[PDB]
């Protein structure tokens, strides 16, 4: 039932590698479907462009914490849009942030999921019950560690960390 997707990452125009994710479609089908669709770019957004992670960036990276990206509309953390509209409800919190390499939804409080997500670099139990965990890095965790090095304690990312390609795997 679970499906897989991938991201090809570039740092300042230089390819850093590929990350392959397994989506927990069997636990959070709705949340996973949104992410999958955003990887393929098959849906048309509120504007006239397709909702796609391609060319989007990781705007906030904090070492020993997580990598955040997915702001496909404003690229600074204030935007985002899902295939269900501007936002959608928290599906469930069955999965916890108990290991590094987990995919989780970023939000602005209860039921405000859109397209922003985070990739954990360590367990983040304080996020349990507040963020929906819907995936796992099954390949390329080493690429994620390379991205981590581009971050700062403030979350500021100096170089451009971009998803140059993506889709189902």
């Amino acid at each position: 039932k679970r499906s897989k997707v991938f991201f090809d990452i570039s740092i300042d125009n230089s390819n850093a590698g590929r990350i392959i994710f397994e989506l927990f479609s069997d636990i959070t089908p709705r949340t996973c479907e949104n992410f999958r669709a955003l990887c393929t770019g098959e849906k048309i957004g509120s504007r006239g462009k397709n909702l796609h992670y391609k060319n989007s960036i990781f705007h906030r990276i904090i070492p020993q914490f997580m990598c955040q990206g997915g702001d496909i509309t404003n690229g600074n953390g204030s935007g985002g849009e899902s295939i269900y509209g501007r936002s959608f409800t928290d599906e469930n919190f069955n999965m916890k942030h108990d290991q590094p390499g987990l995919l989780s939804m970023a939000n602005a409080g209860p039921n405000t999921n859109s397209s922003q997500f985070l990739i954990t670099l360590v367990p983040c139990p304080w996020l349990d019950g507040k963020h929906v965990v819907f995936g796992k890095v099954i390949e390329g965790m080493n690429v994620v560690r390379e991205m981590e090095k581009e971050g700062a304690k403030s979350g500021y990312v100096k170089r451009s960390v971009v998803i140059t390609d993506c889709g189902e795997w």
């Binding site: 985002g80 939000n107 996020l127 979350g155």
Partner: peptide, 11 residues
């Protein structure tokens, strides 16, 4: 602190 929000980044 260490949160992952979208728009008002807190402590």
């Amino acid at each position: 602190x260490l949160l992952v929000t979208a728009g008002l980044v807190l402590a």
